[PDB]
């Protein structure tokens, strides 16, 4: 009840082998009372718990309107993830409630959105893209840029290419480009090379970025060079987390002047927060 570390039971509905090193899972809580009331903001993460192994955070990549269901794109890079990869549909896992503050979609209405995803961080941006598509009336033209580096690692490439015609019909420019695949029959170039061709009007554009922070400096410079508003830039950064309620102490960012904690002051940050305290990147 009042225990903050408490969990809830959830069963995997369907497993979807996304790529070689990533896998997509579908979840629904066993308790109907939790299923009918559970909700989240796009950008909030979930403390997935394998019984007897450990707890790991995975960002929700589903539409919040679909109550009782959510998807978690997990890559096998370690112990808990390796155990997770062996989980079959119709198996049990303990999941904790949503944590952190999602992307500021409530403040966003009507303005153009530049959703630029790099590498693994596509999942929160996939969630905000699905949220925007589910309420397409209250948003302008949106550009979703998802990039990778090995060609085959374009997450949800089939889903985006299937919706490409409808996206072009609905004033949506979804762009997928590779960084280190000259032989791949597609788009070559960094995400900065493709945000110059953005349909969004810089005067009234909100920008959401996710992925590796080493390209954050380059994308910030490219966005600010084109006149995009620095007051409407938001990013996501990851650190070690074991609690999600602000008591673990592992996810500490910033300096003494501003010592933010990601589980309570994020994981969706602001541009002036990023440039204000060095070491966030």
């Amino acid at each position: 009840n009042d225990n903050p570390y408490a969990l809830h039971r959830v069963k995997v509905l369907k497993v979807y082998s996304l790529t070689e090193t990533e896998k997509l899972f579908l979840f629904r809580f066993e308790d109907p009372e939790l299923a009918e009331k559970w909700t989240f903001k796009p950008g909030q993460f979930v403390q997935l718990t394998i019984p007897g192994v450990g707890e790991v955070p995975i960002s929700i990549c589903s539409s919040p309107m679909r109550k009782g269901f959510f998807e978690l794109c997990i890559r096998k890079a370690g112990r808990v993830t390796t155990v997770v990869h062996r989980l079959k549909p119709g198996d049990t896992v303990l999941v904790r409630g949503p944590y952190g503050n999602g992307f500021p979609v409530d403040e966003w209405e009507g303005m153009d959105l530049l959703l630029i995803a790099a590498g693994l961080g596509t999942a929160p941006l996939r969630s905000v893209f699905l949220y925007a598509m589910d309420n397409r009336w209250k948003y302008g033209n949106i550009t979703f840029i998802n990039t990778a580096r090995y060609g085959k690692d374009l997450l949800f490439y089939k889903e985006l290419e299937a919706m490409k015609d409808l996206a072009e019909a609905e004033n949506v420019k979804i762009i997928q480009s590779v960084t280190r695949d000259p032989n791949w029959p597609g788009l070559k170039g960094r995400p900065q090379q493709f945000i110059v061709e953005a349909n969004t009007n810089p005067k009234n554009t909100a920008v959401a970025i996710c992925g590796p922070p080493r390209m954050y400096k380059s994308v910030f410079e490219a966005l600010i060079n084109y006149g995009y508003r620095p007051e409407n830039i938001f990013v996501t950064l990851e650190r070690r987390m074991k609690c999600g309620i602000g008591k673990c102490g592992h996810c500490n960012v910033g300096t003494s002047t501003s010592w933010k904690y990601i589980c309570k002051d994020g994981p969706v940050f602001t541009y002036f927060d990023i440039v204000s305290t060095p070491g966030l990147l």
Partner: protein, 343 residues
């Protein structure tokens, strides 16, 4: 608050009547010059005048090794192992330790109240004792010398007894129940208490303002002092595991031989240990030893806007108990420039 005078011939009698309520935790001798909070059986072994405890009084509320849950893999369920605790009376908590407990309350009871911490914080009586500054204590620099809230009794030492400030409820209940042993204060003891407080303030080794440490620390993030002191550092985590305001811990899973039963264990983990800031792929956000050292310094020199105090309470446990004798206050004043003054 009421001021109740306890003559020195009734101190042990009051402690014996205090043991009626519940278990008493007071600082006792554990080695030649080491103090720790051990459970009291014989009252005469209590040392009233002690410099500092090897473990802060946070071990009663934030236990050093706590079993959170016990689980069964088949039909996956976690059962929280929480046991009812009788009201325990923690006797001999310094002002710095009281402020540390307040800081941990602001950390652990905010937004999401930790059940394990709250159940033990709601059933504890903190008795504050006026300390005397040794060569390490600098509670005046961080402003933790005197406290107003958090204590149900404050034993201020007097030449002819102990001055007891009740301050909070249930302190009134204890004092009123044992009022036979208690007396009433007048100016005779008030002047002596004021003189003792003046002597205590004057006995501090350090007296300077530390207003702008949090700002200047970011300008000098790449000082050679960090490299030198980190190379002197041993990376043993004693400075954090004995710290009263370190909220960090490590969660581990242990599974029994049957493969179906086990439990989840929580213990204090420091920055100096490698796996505190590690992510997948072997990437560490503070890889080098100086990086973790500076991270600890910056984190302890942060600002808590809930109560306006820096997380460091100036107890001096980190500098005293460091095997390499790395001075925290010396390093931080060298950041200001009180030791070098090159620019």
């Amino acid at each position: 608050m009421r001021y109740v005078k306890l003559p020195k011939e009734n101190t042990y009698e009051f402690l014996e009547r205090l043991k009626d309520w519940g278990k008493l935790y007071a600082p006792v001798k554990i080695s030649d010059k080491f103090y720790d909070f051990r459970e009291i059986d014989d009252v005469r072994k209590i040392e009233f005048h002690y410099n500092r405890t090897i473990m802060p009084p946070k071990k009663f509320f934030f236990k050093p090794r706590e079993k959170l849950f016990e689980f069964d893999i088949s039909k996956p369920e976690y059962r929280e192992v929480i046991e009812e605790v009788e009201p325990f009376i923690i006797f001999g908590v310094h002002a710095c330790d009281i402020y540390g407990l307040k800081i941990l309350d602001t950390v652990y009871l905010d937004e999401f109240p930790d059940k394990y911490y709250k159940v033990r914080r709601e059933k504890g009586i903190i008795i504050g004792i006026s300390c005397m500054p040794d060569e390490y204590c600098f509670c005046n620099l961080r402003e933790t010398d005197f406290a107003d809230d958090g204590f149900d009794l404050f034993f201020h030492e007097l030449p002819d007894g102990w001055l007891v400030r009740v301050g909070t409820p249930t302190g009134h209940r204890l004092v009123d129940k044992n009022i036979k042993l208690f007396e009433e204060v007048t100016d005779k003891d008030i002047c002596a208490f004021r003189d003792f407080e003046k002597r205590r303030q004057q006995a501090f080794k350090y007296h300077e303002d530390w207003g702008n440490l949090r700002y200047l620390l970011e300008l000098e993030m790449e000082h050679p002092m960090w490299d030198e002191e980190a190379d002197k550092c041993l990376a043993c985590g004693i400075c954090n595991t004995t710290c009263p305001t370190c909220r960090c811990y490590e969660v581990q899973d242990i599974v029994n031989l049957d493969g179906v039963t086990g439990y989840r264990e929580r213990r204090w983990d420091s920055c100096q240990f490698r796996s505190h800031g590690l992510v997948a792929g072997g990437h560490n956000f503070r890889p080098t030893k100086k990086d973790r050292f500076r991270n600890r310094y910056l984190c302890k020199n942060a600002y808590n806007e809930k109560l306006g105090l820096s997380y460091c309470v100036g107890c001096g446990r980190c500098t005293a108990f460091c095997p390499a004798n790395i001075s925290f206050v010396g390093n931080l004043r060298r950041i200001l420039g009180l030791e070098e003054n090159k620019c």
